[PDB]
Amino acid sequence: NIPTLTLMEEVLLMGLRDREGYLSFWNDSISYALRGCIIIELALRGKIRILDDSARKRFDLSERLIEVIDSSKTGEVLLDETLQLMKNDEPLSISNWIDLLSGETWNLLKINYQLKQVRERLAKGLVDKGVLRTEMKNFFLFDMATHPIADASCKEAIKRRVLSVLVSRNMELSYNEYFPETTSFKIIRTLALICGSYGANVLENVLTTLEYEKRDKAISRAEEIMAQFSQYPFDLEKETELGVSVNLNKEVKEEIENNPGHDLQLEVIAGVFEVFSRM
Amino acid sequence: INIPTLTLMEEVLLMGLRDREGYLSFWNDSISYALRGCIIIELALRGKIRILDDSARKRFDLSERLIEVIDSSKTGEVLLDETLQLMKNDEPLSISNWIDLLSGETWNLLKINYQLKQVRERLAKGLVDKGVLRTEMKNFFLFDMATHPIADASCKEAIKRRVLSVLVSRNMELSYNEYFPETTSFKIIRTLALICGSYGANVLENVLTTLEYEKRDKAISRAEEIMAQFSQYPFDLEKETELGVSVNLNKEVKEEIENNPGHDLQLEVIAGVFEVFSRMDM
Amino acid sequence: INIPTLTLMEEVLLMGLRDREGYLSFWNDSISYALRGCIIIELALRGKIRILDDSARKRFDLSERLIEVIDSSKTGEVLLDETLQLMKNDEPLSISNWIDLLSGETWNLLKINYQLKQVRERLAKGLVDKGVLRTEMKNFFLFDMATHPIADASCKEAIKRRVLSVLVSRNMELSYNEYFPETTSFKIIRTLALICGSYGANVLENVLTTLEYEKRDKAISRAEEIMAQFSQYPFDLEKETELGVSVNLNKEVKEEIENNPGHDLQLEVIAGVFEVFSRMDML
Amino acid sequence: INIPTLTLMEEVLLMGLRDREGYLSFWNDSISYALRGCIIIELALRGKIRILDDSARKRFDLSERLIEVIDSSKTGEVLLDETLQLMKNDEPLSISNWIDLLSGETWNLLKINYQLKQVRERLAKGLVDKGVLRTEMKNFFLFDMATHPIADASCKEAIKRRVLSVLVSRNMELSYNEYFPETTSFKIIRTLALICGSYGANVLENVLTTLEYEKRDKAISRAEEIMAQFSQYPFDLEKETELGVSVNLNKEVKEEIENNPGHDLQLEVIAGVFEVFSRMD
Numbered sequence A: 001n002i003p004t005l006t007l008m009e010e011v012l013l014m015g016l017r018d019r020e021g022y023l024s025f026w027n028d029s030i031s032y033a034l035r036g037c038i039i040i041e042l043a044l045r046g047k048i049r050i051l052d053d054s055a056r057k058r059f060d061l062s063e064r065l066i067e068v069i070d071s072s073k074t075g076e077v078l079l080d081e082t083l084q085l086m087k088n089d090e091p092l093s094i095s096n097w098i099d100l101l102s103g104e105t106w107n108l109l110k111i112n113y114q115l116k117q118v119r120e121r122l123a124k125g126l127v128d129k130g131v132l133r134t135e136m137k138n139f140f141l142f143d144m145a146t147h148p149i150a151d152a153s154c155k156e157a158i159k160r161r162v163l164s165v166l167v168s169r170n171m172e173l174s175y176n177e178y179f180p181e182t183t184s185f186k187i188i189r190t191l192a193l194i195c196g197s198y199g200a201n202v203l204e205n206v207l208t209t210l211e212y213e214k215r216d217k218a219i220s221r222a223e224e225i226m227a228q229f230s231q232y233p234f235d236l237e238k239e240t241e242l243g244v245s246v247n248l249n250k251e252v253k254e255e256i257e258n259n260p261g262h263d264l265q266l267e268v269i270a271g272v273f274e275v276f277s278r279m
Numbered sequence B: 001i002n003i004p005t006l007t008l009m010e011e012v013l014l015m016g017l018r019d020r021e022g023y024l025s026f027w028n029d030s031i032s033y034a035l036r037g038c039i040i041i042e043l044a045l046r047g048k049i050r051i052l053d054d055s056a057r058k059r060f061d062l063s064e065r066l067i068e069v070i071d072s073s074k075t076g077e078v079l080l081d082e083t084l085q086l087m088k089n090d091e092p093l094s095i096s097n098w099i100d101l102l103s104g105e106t107w108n109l110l111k112i113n114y115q116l117k118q119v120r121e122r123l124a125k126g127l128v129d130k131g132v133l134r135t136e137m138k139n140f141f142l143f144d145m146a147t148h149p150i151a152d153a154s155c156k157e158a159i160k161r162r163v164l165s166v167l168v169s170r171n172m173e174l175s176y177n178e179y180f181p182e183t184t185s186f187k188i189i190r191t192l193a194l195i196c197g198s199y200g201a202n203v204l205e206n207v208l209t210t211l212e213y214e215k216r217d218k219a220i221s222r223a224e225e226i227m228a229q230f231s232q233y234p235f236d237l238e239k240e241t242e243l244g245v246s247v248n249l250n251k252e253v254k255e256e257i258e259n260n261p262g263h264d265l266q267l268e269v270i271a272g273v274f275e276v277f278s279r280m281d282m
Numbered sequence C: 001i002n003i004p005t006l007t008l009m010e011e012v013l014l015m016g017l018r019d020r021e022g023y024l025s026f027w028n029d030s031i032s033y034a035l036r037g038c039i040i041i042e043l044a045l046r047g048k049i050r051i052l053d054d055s056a057r058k059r060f061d062l063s064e065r066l067i068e069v070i071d072s073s074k075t076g077e078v079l080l081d082e083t084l085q086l087m088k089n090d091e092p093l094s095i096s097n098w099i100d101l102l103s104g105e106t107w108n109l110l111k112i113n114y115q116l117k118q119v120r121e122r123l124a125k126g127l128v129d130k131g132v133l134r135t136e137m138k139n140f141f142l143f144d145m146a147t148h149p150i151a152d153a154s155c156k157e158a159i160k161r162r163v164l165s166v167l168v169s170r171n172m173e174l175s176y177n178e179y180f181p182e183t184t185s186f187k188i189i190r191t192l193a194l195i196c197g198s199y200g201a202n203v204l205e206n207v208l209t210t211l212e213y214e215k216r217d218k219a220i221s222r223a224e225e226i227m228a229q230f231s232q233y234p235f236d237l238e239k240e241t242e243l244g245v246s247v248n249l250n251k252e253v254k255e256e257i258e259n260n261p262g263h264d265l266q267l268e269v270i271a272g273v274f275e276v277f278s279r280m281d282m283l
Numbered sequence D: 001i002n003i004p005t006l007t008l009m010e011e012v013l014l015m016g017l018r019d020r021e022g023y024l025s026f027w028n029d030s031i032s033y034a035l036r037g038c039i040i041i042e043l044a045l046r047g048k049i050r051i052l053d054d055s056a057r058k059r060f061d062l063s064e065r066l067i068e069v070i071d072s073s074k075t076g077e078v079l080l081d082e083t084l085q086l087m088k089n090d091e092p093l094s095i096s097n098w099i100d101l102l103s104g105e106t107w108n109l110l111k112i113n114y115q116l117k118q119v120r121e122r123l124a125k126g127l128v129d130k131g132v133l134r135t136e137m138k139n140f141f142l143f144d145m146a147t148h149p150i151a152d153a154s155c156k157e158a159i160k161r162r163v164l165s166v167l168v169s170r171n172m173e174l175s176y177n178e179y180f181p182e183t184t185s186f187k188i189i190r191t192l193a194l195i196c197g198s199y200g201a202n203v204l205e206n207v208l209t210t211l212e213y214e215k216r217d218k219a220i221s222r223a224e225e226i227m228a229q230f231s232q233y234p235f236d237l238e239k240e241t242e243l244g245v246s247v248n249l250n251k252e253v254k255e256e257i258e259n260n261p262g263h264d265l266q267l268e269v270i271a272g273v274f275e276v277f278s279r280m281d
Helices: A007-014 A030-045 A054-058 A077-087 A094-102 A120-129 A153-164 A186-199 A203-207 A212-229 A249-255 A263-277 B006-016 B029-044 B055-059 B078-088 B095-101 B119-129 B151-168 B188-201 B213-229 B251-258 B262-279 C008-015 C031-045 C055-061 C078-088 C094-102 C111-114 C119-128 C155-166 C187-200 C213-230 C249-258 C265-281 D008-014 D030-045 D057-061 D078-088 D094-104 D119-131 D155-169 D187-199 D213-230 D249-260 D266-279
Strands: A049-050 A066-068 A136-138 A143-144 B048-050 B067-069 B136-139 B144-149 C049-051 C067-069 C135-138 C143-147 D050-051 D064-068 D135-139 D146-148
Touching: A007 A030, A007 A120, A007 A153, A007 A186, A007 A203, A007 D094, A030 A049, A030 A077, A030 A094, A030 A120, A030 A186, A030 C111, A049 A263, A077 A094, A077 A120, A094 C155, A120 C143, A143 B029, A153 A186, A153 A203, A153 A212, A153 C155, A153 C213, A153 D266, A186 A212, A186 B078, A186 D266, A203 A212, A212 A263, A212 B055, A212 C135, A212 D078, B006 B029, B006 B119, B006 B151, B029 B048, B029 B078, B029 B119, B029 B188, B048 B136, B048 B262, B048 D249, B067 B078, B067 B251, B067 C049, B067 C119, B078 B095, B144 C055, B151 B188, B151 B213, B188 B262, B213 B262, B213 C155, C008 C031, C008 C055, C008 C119, C031 C049, C031 C094, C031 C187, C031 C265, C049 C265, C067 C078, C078 C094, C078 C119, C094 C111, C094 C265, C094 D078, C143 D094, C155 C187, C155 C213, C155 D187, C187 C213, C187 C265, C249 C265, D008 D030, D008 D119, D030 D050, D030 D078, D030 D094, D030 D119, D030 D187, D050 D266, D064 D078, D064 D094, D078 D094, D078 D119, D094 D187, D094 D266, D146 D213, D155 D187, D155 D213, D187 D249, D187 D266, D213 D249, D213 D266
Parallel strands: none
Antiparallel strands: A049 A066, A136 A143, B048 B067, B136 B144, C049 C067, C135 C143, D050 D064, D135 D146
16 A cells, blocks of 8 residues: 655655755755655545535635544654644635645634754655665764665665656556555656646756657646646646656556546645645 | 876875874865875866756756767776776766765665775875885784885975965965976966865865964865855856965966867866865755 | 953963854864963962972972962853862862873873863853853754854954064063053963963964964964973073063063062963973873 | 784884874884884794794804794785795894895995885785774875775773883873783783883883873883893893882783793894894983
């Protein structure tokens, strides 16, 4: 079922350089996308679902309310702690959750939902996972913890998956220890990766190698897939004019068919995609 | 091209070198990586590489544009010649991609061999050969090592006065000497690269320490002006500084490039590399 | 009289500190060890220690001579207080030996809690408490860090002018400020200690790099001379210099000493420490 | 297997080292000289050589006497094996003549490659292999350089302990350890060889600086007496010390010679060497 790295962690990984240091200066765009991954992640793990009233249809996807379906611990603190919050509140919309957890809306009687030390906790988790090691750099006025990458294969595998969907003619996802051949919702997870990393604005980081025609094609293909998968139900009949991942429609159809009765959750991820494009 | 005797990596190395007990000078990742940006700039000023001339590039960052070999004849500088080797038989790669490989900043299993090794060693060898440094044996307990004290302090001074001329004089008016003749191609660019290289290596402050603090603070930020001005292409030579320092840079640069016509494809590389120096804090 | 706001440790450190991106300045064993030297010079001038007045000592290198606690009430400087507490209750030890222990350069396991942990950061907290440094948070991708940029650039300018007056100047004439008033006891000694600790810590050079080399060369040379002169007790205040730099040093130091009597058992400690700064090339 | 893990030259060189990193001594020509002295003391102890047993010898100083190779098999070390190389394939020479030759001090056209080269650096490798040093790559501004700080610090504390045992404490109770077990033969001749070697080499003072003025003078005095006493032969093991340090030395040396008997032609060599050590000052 569930892969080793969460989406938040793959997105974080997306902003780092292969050896030491970083590519993206830390902005609140990335910090907002990560809250998005959290919500996507909750839906994937069958813990939340779009609130089941047909009256939601009069509203945008991202304006639609979410329902805690299962409040049992998940393992992941960031996930668990937002879950906690959800279990104790009226059904709120996707957009509202993302705001509150970002500290981007202001609410008095909500004090407070804003998630704290996300960056740092994601990093600690990433050490425990063994993706990052810890190095103690020595500065002029203090010592400092530092987390350069330990396993390069991890970042490389993510890169290839992403490219598999957005440069290569036929998407063929590769697998490994962190992301096995048997993870449920495999294609949606990687789509979710691209859509997250687009709105965190860290997606272009994996594209800097490529020749110019291919970097263009990847970005447009990316916004193409954002257009499709931020409406519900998905438009799986619309064919790509580009020469890129021409079999995604087929491969998704085969995936949702073999995970039936999950529609009430796929719709939340779509709302989240909607928020990523609006950002 | 009129090439001066010292390469930029050499020039940047001397910026980071103490007068006495030079091996005790401060070495780190920053100054290391800057040196590789120098290689690239140097390559460009010798007409060996240029930006791959495809207008699609205009939609991407300077430091992310592909470069190509246009002359591969050996330069007679091992560090430059070695990198030409690698460039000459690879498909064209981006500016910041080259800097990364040559540094070993990237985990490409097929290009583990692109990292230049013993850059300091060779750079000091060349400085010894050029008569800037001497060699002398230094004695402690369990071993003797070769140290390289400075043989000609006038070499480095003539560099420092160049930096200063851009960074504290109302008007730059640079001075020449045997290593850096008034006859040299791109004297001003070569200087600004020196300054941008230094800033990236974090050795630019080294030469400013004696100045009264505001003349000093004006210099750092004039440099920062310079780096923003010249890490975009074409250069915006119409923005005048509000700082009273090298007021005449623009006038003088425009003249420089109104001669040596038709090297836009190569000036553009320099500006890409200047972009890398800017983001080196990351 | 009284003592200046900044300690010599704090002064040594500022000489090693860059204007922008200070956390990137060069840190190392040398600066670390020198700071221990400064601690003990500091206690000497504060009338807290002196050498043990046993005539036998005259047979041994200054850096090998035993020193004893004179009085041991808090100074307010946590780093001085802490080391004085160790000293307060132990057999008299030699100068170089204390410096070794307070650095943890010496392995003898019976004295492991003698090493002063957290010098850098405590000397930073000191400097912030002092006006000298602000503290603002800078964001890196993966974490945040407290940064300490210079609030009073004038403080470190004045330090640097004192070095220059001694070392670049036909006649040393010292400028004073609120950190270091004219009232300061042993103001010249304090200045020479600074130059010496700085030379040992290998940060003296960075104060001189903008000048013409004849002037830089001359200044390092004078600096060595000053070490030679003062790494012996009593001080050879009679050697004329032939470099034409701080030509008036002997006269003013003499005058400083006469005007401040019966501190030889303290002055001597300083000669010791100066000896140790001389030998630091051996770390 | 009854030889200790470290040779006397390794311990003499070790004495020149600061506890963690760096040196207390400049490398010079007398430390260099003593080391060759040690080689010879080392070889006598391992029963590889002895003074040649001619009557004529008595009419000469100990260091002016000749020595003969008894057994010349390997010892595992590079510096002991090499000198045996030259010693085995050559006519009997005086012990001081040997020290002179190996160190490059006298000149000799018919024996010109007898100077042991890279002694300093070859001794360091052995120390590394013995795990007394590690090797640590350092970056200066123009090159990389391998440096050898201390790895096992306790080795060197145990040495400082022995030396302080016979030079400082009223009674002497040598402490044993991994590197220098209680069952190593000639435990004390070796300890003195050590304090003598150092004295000559001039690194002895380096383990004393830690102590009271009086205790420091006494230590040196004691070393000089031991030097005086053990550079004659047979040793006057009945001269008594008027300075209350290491008072049971004689008694303890006695039990040592008694316990390992019929080695007199080897001790004589080490006495000879002690004489070369006292005559460099």
